[PDB]
A paper describes a structure:
Retinoid X receptor α ([name]α), a member of the nuclear receptor superfamily and a validated drug target, exists in different oligomeric forms that regulate a broad spectrum of cellular processes under both physiological and pathophysiological conditions. Like other nuclear receptors, [name]α comprises an intrinsically disordered N-terminal A/B domain with poorly defined functions, a central DNA-binding domain (DBD), and a ligand-binding domain (LBD) in which α-helices are arranged around a central hydrophobic ligand-binding pocket (LBP). A unique property of [name]α is an auto-repressive mechanism involving homotetramerization, in which a ‘dimer-of-dimers’ pack in a bottom-to-bottom manner, with H12 from each monomer invading (and invaded by) a neighbouring domain across the tetramer interface.
We found that the [name]α-LBD/K-80003 complex adopts a tetrameric structure, similar to those observed in crystals of apo-[name]α or [name]α-LBD/tRA-isomer complex, in which two [name]α-LBD canonical homodimers (labelled A1/B1 and A2/B2) pack in a bottom-to-bottom manner with point group symmetry D2. These ‘tetramer’ interfaces comprise three sub-regions: parallel packing between symmetry-related H3 helices; ‘end-to-end’ packing between H11 that reduces their length by two helical turns (compared with the agonist-bound structure); and the invasion of each H12 helix into its apposing domain, where it binds to the coregulator-binding groove, consisting of elements of H3 and H4. Thus, K-80003A and K-80003B are arranged about the A1/B2 pseudo-dyad, making similar but distinct interactions.
Author numbering:
A (entry chain A), C (entry chain D): 263 to 460
B (entry chain C): 228 to 242, 261 to 458
D (entry chain B): 227 to 241, 261 to 458
Write the structure that this text describes.
Amino acid sequence: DPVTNICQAADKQLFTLVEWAKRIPHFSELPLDDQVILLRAGWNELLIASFSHRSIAVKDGILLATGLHVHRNSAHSAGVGAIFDRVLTELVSKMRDMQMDKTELGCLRAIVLFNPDSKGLSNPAEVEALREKVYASLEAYCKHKYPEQPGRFAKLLLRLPALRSIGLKCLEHLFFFKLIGDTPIDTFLMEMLEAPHQ
Amino acid sequence: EDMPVERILEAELAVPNDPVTNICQAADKQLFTLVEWAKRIPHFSELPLDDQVILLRAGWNELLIASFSHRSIAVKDGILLATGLHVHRNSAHSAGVGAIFDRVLTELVSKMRDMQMDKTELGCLRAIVLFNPDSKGLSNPAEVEALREKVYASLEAYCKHKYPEQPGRFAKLLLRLPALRSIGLKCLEHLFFFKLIGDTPIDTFLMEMLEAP
Amino acid sequence: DPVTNICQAADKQLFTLVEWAKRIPHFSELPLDDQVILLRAGWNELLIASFSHRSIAVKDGILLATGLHVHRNSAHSAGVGAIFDRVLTELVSKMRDMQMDKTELGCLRAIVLFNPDSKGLSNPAEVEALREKVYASLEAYCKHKYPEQPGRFAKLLLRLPALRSIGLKCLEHLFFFKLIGDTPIDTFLMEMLEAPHQ
Amino acid sequence: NEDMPVERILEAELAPNDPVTNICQAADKQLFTLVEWAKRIPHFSELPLDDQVILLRAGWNELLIASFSHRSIAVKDGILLATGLHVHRNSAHSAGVGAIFDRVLTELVSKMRDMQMDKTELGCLRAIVLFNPDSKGLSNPAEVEALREKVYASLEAYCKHKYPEQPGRFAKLLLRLPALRSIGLKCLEHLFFFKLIGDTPIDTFLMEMLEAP
Ligand SMILES: CC1=C(CC(=O)O)c2cc(F)ccc2/C1=C\c1ccc(C(C)C)cc1
Ligand SMILES: CC1=C(CC(=O)O)c2cc(F)ccc2/C1=C\c1ccc(C(C)C)cc1
Ligand SMILES: CC1=C(CC(=O)O)c2cc(F)ccc2/C1=C\c1ccc(C(C)C)cc1
Ligand SMILES: CC1=C(CC(=O)O)c2cc(F)ccc2/C1=C\c1ccc(C(C)C)cc1
Ligand SMILES: CC1=C(CC(=O)O)c2cc(F)ccc2/C1=C\c1ccc(C(C)C)cc1
Ligand SMILES: CC1=C(CC(=O)O)c2cc(F)ccc2/C1=C\c1ccc(C(C)C)cc1
């Protein structure tokens, strides 16, 4: 019964996300209504950034949080090979080519979280302010840890546009469901069809 | 006839914890009832099992929308999901699916109520959707198209008998399927089902988490 | 300049559409605002219904109004083969198998036109009324021309759902543009690039 | 900068009747303005012609949005098209593209106004969008990424010099590109450009024919 395992895995993944956001300086100081808005609008891009960076070691595939490998062949077989190739070329391979470390990933995700354009925010300017403090911190990090790379800071920020559009395509083409859910749903339905019935 | 409209009506009437799992359970529970309904449809179980899976994956969205749309005739300005939850227009706009919510009331619930669509007619329309010969991967689309023909053969017969003064009632019923098709597509992209039965469990889980240690 | 010829052809095709709608009984009697709304909401499905029926004679392709033949090999090459095949299997081929005549097409297109679900109608019930008069007329036609096919009438109406979904996928995936505009736009832009510099 | 002179980028920035064909001609002319601008961008013409076409097809949508968004800094509740026509919020709502219109004002025009984005800074951001190394089919994506690197190197130098009191202005400029990317995708599926410059010519053409004999 893989379905039950994946729903439980997601709840752990969701738990980790909120805990991660609480450790971000000043996030909890925002109005609780604003905290929920930011997680509602950002969880999609925050996950894509995570397993993209986690998949630097992988070749032609993405490594999900459950240790599950997914190769681009399994993706094309599921009819979502176009989006899958965008993850590899625009995120995974670019993250690998520049050797984006875990501090730079965390900063980019905090920037994504502090999205002042999110609809319904009670204090967008405070969100914008926390955004500024994050990337001002990221710039300092890049200057001192990579002094020879004067453009690393902008290079990092200029991967957020590719993350924005990829996040939208995943929601539109049901990328998450069709990567793992195509076959288990056939198995899941067959079980119900053979069950006892009156 | 060969597709007894009585057998179609009998099938219609015979049907804190981690929040994502709670949503999976509700979705699993609602899918199973849809399978038990489809197996009470005449001749459906006689199809190849692989084709039964195809027809379900292809129609599960529209079949559920048809269910709670006709179920919401009694309630007003809201939809009654199978879980007993009474979801209203404001509860859906907060979840970001306000546009779809109004289309369900305007194009399905309200039109169902005006013409007083009985549960026998509902069952036929859902059987027609179930027997969709356009579903991709069908081993023999012709026998699916044949079964569909038997359903709307019986439905027309049922309509001309139960409502003789309304000769065009039969066509009127079929002409709600385009709207049901369009609405079905919007529910997937907006995660309509996920959000309605899960918007509050998620907000509840979040609110508790953001205040927890 | 093939691009310019397409815009002329569109003006003609649009003119033909408005005249067609004015010949429909009682259409012009509707409020002019409602006439525009119904043409705003229906032109997409009305065009798809036309060239799908126009393509009955074609094999593995669709015939556009400008006589331009498009084969599926060119559509799949343009990255829209999925939608293209849906036109063929769900519309063109089905029109062929049942030998849908031009009278049945006109009735179906008029039913699509009189769409009571169109947003902003002044009198939705009046449009629904004209809709009832059309398909009641279509039923009589089917009974006389194909009495041995008692379900022909419903069979026709049950292509409208497929036409609805195919109409939505064409707009979101820009099926019209990508069908032909892959090569002309390259030439169109290349012509702009080889213009004088400075 | 030495390799990507920020001065050349600012120079480039400053440098009835048939309704469909009327729109095509207007779109044709507006597209050509974008091409002439792109050719005056240093090193773009040095690229293979096939790559130049790829970058134009890939960025034309966002490049136009960035253009008329900055030009609408002065006006309020509307956008100022290149033709001088003042389109208002409700005029876009009439076309059914009211949600996109508000996003342009809130996420682009308003933000551009608050930070007093000058035309030099705009030109650089558009040059960054132009040099998109993610565009599919490029013969040498590396040189495109190099050209993009030169641009935002110059912009950062320009920003640290022209606004020394705003150390975070450079990142503030780049962090509008995600919104520009998101909004650009929504304009395509809604036919945003077609409608604004064509909404009225169609109603004019429709109204006159529905009244005509
Ligand atoms: C993309 C994705 C990741 C990757 C990550 O976040 O590292 C993950 C990790 C988890 F632990 C659980 C689920 C997921 C997941 C998608 C998903 C897929 C199907 C479902 C339902 C429909 C069962 C729910 C979610
Ligand atoms: C449907 C949905 C909403 C509601 C909305 O966004 O309209 C939401 C809001 C949040 F704040 C967080 C998650 C979600 C969410 C689904 C979800 C998706 C993946 C996961 C795991 C894999 C981390 C867990 C949950
Ligand atoms: C058949 C099917 C599709 C494909 C489609 O209809 O286009 C889909 C797309 C989605 F995004 C989510 C679910 C589904 C789905 C069935 C399903 C139903 C219950 C569940 C729960 C029990 C975990 C999981 C999956
Ligand atoms: C599908 C289609 C037909 C077929 C028909 O309607 O029978 C047609 C006939 C005409 F005369 C003109 C255009 C079209 C057309 C699509 C189209 C394609 C590109 C464009 C712009 C982007 C230039 C605009 C429209
Ligand atoms: C964008 C657009 C609208 C407005 C909308 O749909 O929001 C509209 C409303 C109408 F009544 C008629 C045409 C159109 C139209 C474009 C169009 C232009 C040429 C053609 C030819 C090829 C038949 C077909 C369609
Ligand atoms: C490059 C390009 C794309 C591809 C994309 O951006 O994804 C597109 C998509 C559309 F839907 C419409 C137009 C276009 C387009 C250019 C174009 C520009 C002027 C014209 C008029 C003058 C006939 C016709 C076409």
